[PDB]
Structure formats: structure tokens, C-alpha cells
Symmetry: C2
């Protein structure tokens, strides 16, 4: 079914490498996406969105992007959950990127 997210934001930190539970390698980063609008009174505010990149694109991400870099992503929203090390069930929704555009 139709599932599309497109964002432009700035990386909060340098990108990382991780593996998924089944051992598949990804790149990860979090985009700070400033709001186009403003909170009642003109105050600047962002959403912080976790992005995941599969296949060789992950290497492009980890080399071209760093903390503060502007990036665009086009992908699908995916949900999952897990139990953290304190035994707490954590729910996430992340953007699984079909492409990443390097804007600087």
C-alpha cells in the first residue's frame, strides 16, 4: 500500500553503521527537520526523525554526511519494537530510505 515520506533536515550527529536483528548492515542518522510553521509565537522548533539506509547507499551516507549536514530523504515509514537492556518495550517509527540526496 501507498507509504511515502519525504524529508529535508540536518543531521544531529555523524551517521553510524549498525546491523538489524537478522545481521543486515545499515547506515543510521537522525534528521532535525525544522518546522515550516511556528509555535503560536514565532519560536523555532524541530522534529527529530530516525532514518535507516540499506545496501551500498549506506557507505555514501557514512562518507558524505556528517553532524550538521543538510540531507534529503525519500522513503517509507516502518514500525518496529524491541525490548531494551532495562527490559522496557520500546516502539519506533523510522524512515527506511529509498534514496538520500546530499544537499551540501
Amino acid at each position: 500500500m501507498l507509504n511515502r515520506v519525504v524529508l529535508v533536515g540536518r543531521l544531529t550527529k555523524d551517521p553510524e553503521y549498525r546491523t538489524t536483528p537478522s545481521g543486515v548492515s545499515v547506515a543510521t542518522f537522525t534528521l532535525a527537520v525544522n518546522r515550516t510553521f511556528t509555535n503560536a509565537q514565532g519560536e523555532r522548533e524541530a522534529d527529530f526523525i530516525n532514518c535507516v539506509v540499506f545496501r551500498r547507499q549506506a557507505d555514501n551516507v557514512n562518507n558524505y554526511l556528517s553532524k550538521g549536514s543538510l540531507a534529503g530523504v525519500d522513503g517509507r515509514l516502518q514500525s518496529r519494537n524491541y525490548e531494551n537492556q532495562e527490559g522496557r518495550r520500546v516502539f519506533v517509527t523510522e524512515v527506511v530510505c529509498d534514496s538520500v540526496q546530499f544537499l551540501e
Copy 2:
């Protein structure tokens, strides 16, 4: 900055509609959005996305959608933090819907 989400799925439950203490219609629901292709064994998978809608759109969602209804949403991906009753920080990601399209007649 650019932040756009568009989904089509089916509600998992009836929507939760309420009017907040300061008079605002708000409705919540979770959209089950089937994935494109299937796992190793040909089994169907879905993503379960938490959606929120306000004001007139919320009123309409409450009037027309129920458990299992097919709907489309156009909105923005929003993050927030809260502290739960145990003092634990919970990170929340939800879609704030600008418009909801009712796909079943």
C-alpha cells in the same frame, strides 16, 4: 523544512475521539499499511503508524471511519518526548494529518 507523509491503510481500531479539556476535537488512530512485497515465505506484513488529527478533520474521522476502514492520510511526521508515570523518557513518533481521505463508500 520539507516534511511530508502520505499513507493508505486500514484503521486497526475504531478511532479515539475526544474533545480535549480546552475544547479541541482530536482523533487518533493507527493505520495498518501493508507492505509492497512479502517476506521469504510469501507472508503479508504491515507497518503500524500512529496518526493524529484535529478539529474538523477529527470530527469527520469520528463520523466516518471505524475499525478496518480504508483511509488515506496526507500530513507531517512529528516527534515528541514525554516522561511516563515511572519517570522514564518515552520518544514518540506520529503522523499529524493535514487531510484524511475516506476511501470506502
